[PDB]
Design a protein around this ligand. Structure first.
Ligand code: MG
Ligand code: MG
Ligand code: MG
Ligand code: MG
Ligand code: MG
Ligand code: MG
Ligand code: MG
Ligand code: MG
Ligand code: MG
Ligand code: MG
Ligand code: MG
Ligand code: MG
Ligand code: MG
Ligand code: MG
Ligand code: MG
Ligand code: MG
Ligand code: MG
Ligand code: MG
Ligand code: MG
Ligand code: MG
Ligand code: MG
Ligand code: MG
Ligand code: MG
Ligand code: MG
Ligand code: MG
Ligand code: MG
Ligand code: MG
Ligand code: MG
Ligand code: MG
Ligand code: MG
Ligand code: MG
Ligand code: MG
Ligand code: MG
Ligand code: MG
Ligand code: MG
Ligand code: MG
Ligand code: MG
Ligand code: MG
Ligand code: MG
Ligand code: MG
Ligand code: MG
Ligand code: MG
Ligand code: MG
Ligand code: MG
Ligand code: MG
Ligand code: MG
Ligand code: MG
Ligand code: MG
Ligand code: MG
Ligand code: MG
Ligand code: MG
Ligand code: MG
Ligand code: MG
Ligand code: MG
Ligand code: MG
Ligand code: MG
Ligand code: MG
Ligand code: MG
Ligand code: MG
Ligand code: MG
Ligand code: MG
Ligand code: MG
Ligand code: MG
Ligand code: MG
Ligand code: MG
Ligand code: MG
Ligand code: MG
Ligand code: MG
Ligand code: MG
Lengths: 159, 187, 105, 104, 147
RNA sequence: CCACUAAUAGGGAACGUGAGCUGGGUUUAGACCGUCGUGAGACAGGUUAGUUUUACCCUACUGAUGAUGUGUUGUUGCCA
RNA sequence: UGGAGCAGAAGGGCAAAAGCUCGCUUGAUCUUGAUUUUCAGUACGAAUACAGACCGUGAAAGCGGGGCCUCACGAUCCUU
RNA sequence: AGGUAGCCAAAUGCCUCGUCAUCUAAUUAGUGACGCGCAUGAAUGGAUGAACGAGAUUCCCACUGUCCCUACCUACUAUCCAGCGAAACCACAGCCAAGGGAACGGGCUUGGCGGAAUCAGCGGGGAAAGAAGACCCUGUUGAGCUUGACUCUAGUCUGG
RNA sequence: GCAGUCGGCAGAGCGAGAAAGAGAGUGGCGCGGACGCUACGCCGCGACGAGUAGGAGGGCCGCUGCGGUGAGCCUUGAAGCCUAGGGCGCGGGC
RNA sequence: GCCUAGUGGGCCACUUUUGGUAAGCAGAACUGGCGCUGCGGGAUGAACCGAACGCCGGGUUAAGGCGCCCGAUGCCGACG
RNA sequence: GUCGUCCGACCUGGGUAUAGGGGCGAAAGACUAAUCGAACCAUCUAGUAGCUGGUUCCCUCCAAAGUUUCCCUCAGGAUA
RNA sequence: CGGCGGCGAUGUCGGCUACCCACCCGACCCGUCUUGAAACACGGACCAAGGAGUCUAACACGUGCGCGAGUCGGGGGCUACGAAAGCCGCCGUGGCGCAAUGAAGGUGAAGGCCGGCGGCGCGCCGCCGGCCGAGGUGGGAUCCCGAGGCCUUCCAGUCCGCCGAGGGCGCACCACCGGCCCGUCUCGCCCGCCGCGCCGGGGAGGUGGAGCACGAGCGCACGUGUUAGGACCCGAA
RNA sequence: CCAUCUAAGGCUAAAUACCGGCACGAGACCGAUAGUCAACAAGUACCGUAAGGGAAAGUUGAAAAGAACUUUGAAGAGAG
């Protein structure tokens, strides 16, 4: 059997990237985390305090509590056949703001900005994003040149 | 061969009362006709409540019924319960109530009728309001039984305020190991 | 073995209890025999009352019952002395006598 | 008598029989684990929200008038569309009756 | 009724509802509360926390009549007397307040839970709760200690 | 290993073959020695004494009557 | 650019440092709860953010409630 | 204390069928020696040794069906008949080859094929019968025996 | 879905793509009409049907004995038993 | 939401995979099967291919086949 | 059949003595009424068994597990 | 079908089944333990009769009935079946329930508004009076109101019924927030008197509790599950 | 301080108990492999030295009316 150690198998996971060791850049610490904000967990190995467990690395959660140097996050964690909503405490170094929700915020701002105008102009805009449609019927111009003829190559033993 | 699961095809909802009471069965025979041949959903809720067990028809005390008809907009209007109207002795003044119920306890009948109220039964309710217009359907507390204090998270897990099953309660009955920090641990 | 959430029970059936089991199939027979003994006693002491001699008023002790009065064993000797009844003629005219009982009030 | 040590073989089937449910998120989640200083001050704020109740009713009744007065202060083919209008039960009623009123 | 029991439908089935692999053996797990600290420890800790151990003082010869003190709340305080006792006290104007002796009805202490109806009262008890006496003073009334 | 011989090849058939035998050896209980063990005792270490049951069933096999058909019987035959 | 050291196994981490040398110290103190880890989502152990004291240290920002992290440990009954 | 007198591949020597001699045509046997003795040895008795032994071995003379190599005779059976008349055992039963199969089939597949009822024999098969494997392992199953196991105890010694 | 069997006290409707009333008032001869509905019943649509361990439901399946009931059966033949007879039920069984 | 039986010996296969010379060997991951399950096909067959099953009639298929056993080429089948 | 012994630690009848953790033993754990490494009879006792065997009518509907953690746990439980 | 045909009384018609026989295809012997049985795994020669989850107690949950903040006479007593049933209430003693918490001493389950008076320095920090008064937010079955409208020449014009934009009160229940009670901790100022004390009471903030926050229990019966009992039946050394 | 009894002597009915005995009555019991071991010449026959162990076994018919007489055979056994 294995060991139940806390950092078992985290040799590359908690390690720093190549030529990215040493001083933590200080705008990591300057980012505002509100209640309810959606963030991504990624354990930095420079700071050994507040370190999330390896099952939270690469998980995304919702911040429920904010303290001086750390936040509490609600994280979905699958425990065999049930998913638990975790209440974990993790420092500011091991988290980063998720960008998955701030494109939905861009979509709702351009969707309420397309509801509130064009209503006075009477036309109808689209808000539900359709998937990638079949390609429309189009003409392909071969102006002058004939399409180049391809043949399979003879087999030559390379080396 | 069809790829469908058959574990939950059969619904486990009551089609009839389990009681062989012929008076309740004549009431069910009335309200099957009403809940089928009327457009009222009140009659459907009445019929499905006539189906239930005694535990799923908990009694309605007078004071709870007083305060639920006390709310603004519920005047000159009939309290309907598909269970027992029991007396509540911590009640000093009983206003005028028009009540329909399956059973009313004997002192509750005395208090309501001395208050100038009317007690209806469900066959009279059907002739008064065939669709249950001017009704307030009420229920007793369905978690009021003491089994639900035993129900929940297991007592012996953190933040589990579940009553355990004890033969007796006292200082030597389930108070030592998992319940004090001094005796090993506390949850 | 225990199952899930349930009571811890200690049944006192670890002895050989089935020899000393006392059924009550003679209960209406005991009642009917006690009744006939009662009417035989009442017929024997024919003008004297059937229940027995007069019993005094006693206060129950031990605070749960000390508001309640009940029938004691017998009138005490100072009660008979103040009533002016001899303590040997009391039981002959039908008065229960308790020599053991003090008065405190 | 050796035996099998560990597997996770039928487990993914057993987890999916009743489903792997996401945990039940409802609004107003519990405040367990929030900062005690913040929560103590939040309870003081909730304790004294009734203090400025008159300013609420004053500004609410003032905001009712300034907006309720402000609302009323300045205030496909000639065959198939026509047949869909005639065969509409409520719109084409008199126009449908005109056929019999010519047909007599 | 043996005819409504499960054993009638189990006639013709080989293992009688107890399985072919793990049978119905005699006592697989010990008798009674065996192994409550060893191999049934998870059940005993999960459902009966505090079963093992020893807490508090011993009291060798306990007389349960000594600490007898049945309590009453103030919401049932007028249920000890009749209804005409309350309505005559309601209608009279001399301030003649009725007495409720809770020892007479069978209680020793008055705790104060409910609201008490607005009319004076004289309540006799062996003991009083602080909230009970302050509610009787608040409605107007007296608390009388008896023994 | 001796000797003969054309040669003195190797194997299988539940390491063929114990209701076929034998019981010398393993491997019960008796006993001796060496080594080991405080001891009871232990020893792919020696030594001696130590009950080998039943077929009349079915098949297979070997013999022995016969059985169906040529009407019955007998003689002489043929050979698949 | 760490090819050294950081008590040790190994891995991760670390350069006006987390290493080395001084200065001062005792946050290696008292007290609730919450959480993570093993997990049954139980304890122990270990750990993490907080909060309430009382302190240390620094010019201060701060930092500290043991050791840079991952290991170094212990229920009931009894005794003290 | 370091095994003395003695004795030895012994009923005690692994290597080992030890080396030499003798016995034989040929001897892992026998005897006589040799001693480096895995691991001989002195009342846990060492060495010897007449007489004795239903004790364990080796060789020789004599004698013989032990054998080459079997044969014949006699008694009682077996056999047949009259009378009498059981038992073990038995899922159903009973011809094989290969295949696959719980890895060695009477049955299944594919082939070979198959003919009433029987008698005397026979020991290949029925993984034949006999007896809930005595070997081995597991069981929180025992019992006999031992002691430096745990806890006691009769007796005994000693003090008051 | 069906209490709507709403009948000389009659008027026999409510499957029809489109929220609701076959509403009511007042000014401008021959005596007729299937069945149904043990409502724990009856009828109609649609989809489906493997099963060890195990769970549940229905048994007008069966045995014995008791309490009610069948103005039950029975010496003009009960129980039991046998049967190449007639049958019923998916089956237990009758 | 409550109550809850049975189970807590597993085994096989594509792909990944550790020990072993290897194994119808021992050990994991993923998914599907067998166990719990008949049916068509692989002659035969726990697991392979097709396909999962109320009692039947007609039709049609899958995977397999179509000399005869044995339904289907008894096609004037194609090219080697 | 062949054998050991057959004047002496000889053979034998009857009487008597020793009784079950006891007797008796020229010693084999032998004998003690076909029973002996603790006789026989009755009772406690229907002793206990995580271990074998068995477990009685029909139809209908649903339908598994051999995995997690803890246990003097590994042929068993508790827990999910 | 508003179409027809043939055969019939001692030798024929029908009888799916039921007895025997024939043939083609299928088809290994059941029970059991097992990953895997037709197995060269064990039990079973045949037939009849007997033969194994019971009863008591406790607990849990579910369901049925009665009464219900209560409920229950079980023990006692009074008046053939009947040893039954009926009754008792100054026979509810008592059980369980209506109150918890603490080891225990013990304590024990809402408050706000108004009138009067930097004492301090309850503008803040108690008592005299009156009034209102048992919380809130979201969802929430039901129910309430109704801008309008549901035609039979067409304008009115009323009543009834139905539908309805929208807006409401919101059952049970869930989630959250406050509130109250007992233990314990921290901070801090007061209030009381028969004895002014090593007295008694109060507040704010956390926190432990099997609590409260307008009841739901009791008795009986049935069913399952877990036990203690011989404990489904047979079995030791 | 207080409370409560007056030990080291004795007798005493009733309520209470009663699988033995004497005499009864009853039953949602059992119905001859059941119910007691025992429905019957049952603690009997039989077994063991003994202590002890311990069965099987009901039914003609309403009434013996239990088959006179003839005949075969030595008779059992037949035929009338
Ligand atoms: Mg299907
Ligand atoms: Mg299914
Ligand atoms: Mg289901
Ligand atoms: Mg269980
Ligand atoms: Mg009396
Ligand atoms: Mg396993
Ligand atoms: Mg089954
Ligand atoms: Mg079984
Ligand atoms: Mg079961
Ligand atoms: Mg089991
Ligand atoms: Mg059991
Ligand atoms: Mg342990
Ligand atoms: Mg061999
Ligand atoms: Mg042989
Ligand atoms: Mg042999
Ligand atoms: Mg031998
Ligand atoms: Mg031997
Ligand atoms: Mg013979
Ligand atoms: Mg701090
Ligand atoms: Mg350091
Ligand atoms: Mg202990
Ligand atoms: Mg020497
Ligand atoms: Mg020789
Ligand atoms: Mg020699
Ligand atoms: Mg020696
Ligand atoms: Mg020696
Ligand atoms: Mg003969
Ligand atoms: Mg065979
Ligand atoms: Mg065959
Ligand atoms: Mg043979
Ligand atoms: Mg065995
Ligand atoms: Mg054996
Ligand atoms: Mg074990
Ligand atoms: Mg032992
Ligand atoms: Mg099915
Ligand atoms: Mg098992
Ligand atoms: Mg493997
Ligand atoms: Mg294996
Ligand atoms: Mg299995
Ligand atoms: Mg399946
Ligand atoms: Mg299949
Ligand atoms: Mg093949
Ligand atoms: Mg495939
Ligand atoms: Mg077909
Ligand atoms: Mg073919
Ligand atoms: Mg002798
Ligand atoms: Mg021996
Ligand atoms: Mg076991
Ligand atoms: Mg087994
Ligand atoms: Mg065939
Ligand atoms: Mg088996
Ligand atoms: Mg096996
Ligand atoms: Mg089988
Ligand atoms: Mg085989
Ligand atoms: Mg076996
Ligand atoms: Mg057999
Ligand atoms: Mg039978
Ligand atoms: Mg209930
Ligand atoms: Mg009687
Ligand atoms: Mg349970
Ligand atoms: Mg038994
Ligand atoms: Mg049991
Ligand atoms: Mg036994
Ligand atoms: Mg005296
Ligand atoms: Mg005396
Ligand atoms: Mg008999
Ligand atoms: Mg009989
Ligand atoms: Mg008998
Ligand atoms: Mg007879």
């Amino acid at each position: 059997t294995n060991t139940k150690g806390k950092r078992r198998g985290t040799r590359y996971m908690f390690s720093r990237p190549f030529r990215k060791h040493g001083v933590v850049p200080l705008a990591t610490y300057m980012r505002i985390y509100k209640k309810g904000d959606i963030v991504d967990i990624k354990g930095m190995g420079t700071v050994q305090k507040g370190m999330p467990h390896k099952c939270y690395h690469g998980k995304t959660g919702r911040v429920y509590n904010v303290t001086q140097h750390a936040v509490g996050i609600v994280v979905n964690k699958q425990v065999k056949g049930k998913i638990l909503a975790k209440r974990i405490n993790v420092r500011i170094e091991h988290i980063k703001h998720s960008k998955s929700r701030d494109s939905f915020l861009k979509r709702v701002k351009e969707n309420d900005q397309k509801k509130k105008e064009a209503k006075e102009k009477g036309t109808w805009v689209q808000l539900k994003r359709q998937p990638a449609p079949p390609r429309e019927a189009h003409f392909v111009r071969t102006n002058g040149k004939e399409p180049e003829l391809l043949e399979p190559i003879p087999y030559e033993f390379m080396a | 061969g069809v790829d469908i699961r058959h574990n939950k095809d059969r619904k486990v909802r009551r089609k009839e009362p389990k009681s062989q009471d012929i008076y309740l069965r004549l009431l069910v025979k009335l309200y099957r006709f009403l809940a089928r041949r009327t457009n009222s959903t009140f009659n459907q809720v009445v019929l499905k409540r006539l189906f239930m067990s005694r535990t799923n028809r908990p009694p309605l005390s007078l004071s709870r019924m007083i305060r639920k008809m006390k709310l603004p907009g519920r005047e000159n209007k009939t309290a309907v319960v598909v269970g027992t109207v029991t007396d509540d002795v911590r009640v000093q003044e009983v206003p005028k109530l028009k009540v329909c119920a399956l059973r009313v306890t004997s002192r509750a009948r005395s208090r309501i009728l001395k208050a100038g109220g009317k007690i209806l039964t469900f066959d009279q309710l059907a002739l008064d309001s065939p669709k249950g217009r001017g009704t307030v359907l009420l229920s007793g507390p369905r978690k009021g039984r003491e089994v639900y204090r035993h129900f929940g998270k297991a007592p012996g897990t953190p933040h589990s305020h579940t009553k355990p099953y004890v033969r007796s309660k006292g200082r030597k009955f389930e108070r030592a190991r998992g319940r004090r920090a001094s005796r090993g641990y506390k949850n | 073995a225990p199952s899930r959430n349930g009571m811890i029970l200690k049944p006192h059936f670890h002895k050989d209890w089935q020899r000393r089991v006392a059924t009550w199939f003679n209960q209406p027979a005991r009642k009917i025999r006690r009744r006939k003994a009662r009417q035989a006693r009442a017929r024997r002491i024919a003008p004297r009352p059937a229940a027995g001699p007069i019993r005094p008023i006693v206060r129950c002790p031990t605070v749960r019952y000390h508001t309640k009065v009940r029938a004691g064993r017998g009138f005490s000797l100072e009660e008979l002395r103040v009533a002016g009844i001899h303590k040997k003629v009391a039981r002959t005219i039908g008065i229960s006598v308790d020599p053991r009982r003090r008065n405190k009030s | 008598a050796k035996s099998k040590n560990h597997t996770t073989h039928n487990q993914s089937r057993k987890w999916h029989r009743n489903g792997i449910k996401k945990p039940r998120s409802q609004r107003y989640e519990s405040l367990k684990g929030v900062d005690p200083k913040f929560l103590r001050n939040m309870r003081f704020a909730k304790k004294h929200n009734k203090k400025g109740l008159k300013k609420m009713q004053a500004n609410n009744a003032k905001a009712m008038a300034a907006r309720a007065e402000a609302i009323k202060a300045l205030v496909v083919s000639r065959k198939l569309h026509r047949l869909a209008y005639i065969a509409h039960p409520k719109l084409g009623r008199r126009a449908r009756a005109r056929i019999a009123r010519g047909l007599r | 009724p043996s005819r409504l029991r499960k054993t009638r439908k189990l006639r013709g089935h080989v293992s009688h509802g107890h399985g072919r692999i793990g049978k119905h053996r005699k006592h697989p797990g010990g008798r009674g509360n065996a192994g409550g600290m060893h191999h049934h420890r998870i059940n005993f800790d999960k459902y009966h926390p505090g079963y093992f151990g020893k807490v508090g003082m011993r009291h060798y010869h306990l007389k349960r009549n000594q600490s007898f003190c049945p309590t009453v709340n103030l919401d049932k305080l007028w249920t000890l007397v009749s209804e005409q006792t309350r309505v005559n006290a309601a209608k009279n104007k001399t301030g003649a307040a009725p007495i409720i002796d809770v020892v007479r009805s069978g209680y020793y202490k008055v705790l104060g839970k409910g609201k008490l109806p607005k009319q004076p009262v004289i309540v006799k008890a062996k003991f009083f709760s602080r909230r009970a006496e302050e509610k009787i003073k608040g409605v107007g009334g007296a608390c009388v200690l008896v023994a």
